[PDB]
Structure 1
Amino acid sequence: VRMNVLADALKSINNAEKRGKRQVLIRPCSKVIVRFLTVMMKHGYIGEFEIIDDHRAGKIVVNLTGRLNKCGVISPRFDVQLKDLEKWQNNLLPSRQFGFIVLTTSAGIMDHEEARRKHTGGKILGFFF
Structure 2
Amino acid sequence: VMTDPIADMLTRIRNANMVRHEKLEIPASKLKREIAEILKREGFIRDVEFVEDSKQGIIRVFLKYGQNNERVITGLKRISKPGLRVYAKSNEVPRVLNGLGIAIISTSQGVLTDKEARAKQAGGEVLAYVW
Offset of 1:96 from its aligned partner?
1.8
What count of residue pairs does the alignment treat as equivalent? Answer: 122
* Superposition CA RMSD, Å: 1.3
Distance 1:99 1:32 in 2: 20
Secondary structure in 2 matching 1:125: strand
Q: In 1, distance between residues paired with 2:121 and 2:99?
A: 21
Are residues 1:45 and 2:50 paired?
no
Displacement, 1:107?
Answer: 1.3
How does the TM-score come out when normalised to structure 1? Answer: 0.87
- Cross-structure match for 2:117: 115
Taking the aligned partners of 2:98 and 2:113, their CA distance within structure 1 comes to 14
1:64: which partner in 2?
Answer: 63
Residue by residue, what CA displacement relative to the aligned partner does 1:71-120 show, whole Å, maximum 9, x if unpaired? 2322133111023224xx4xxx3x22400110000111111111111111
2:87 aligned partner, one-letter code? D
Percent of counterpart pairs with the same letter? 25
* Structure 1: 5+ residue stretches without partners: none
Counterpart of 1:77 in structure 2 is: 85
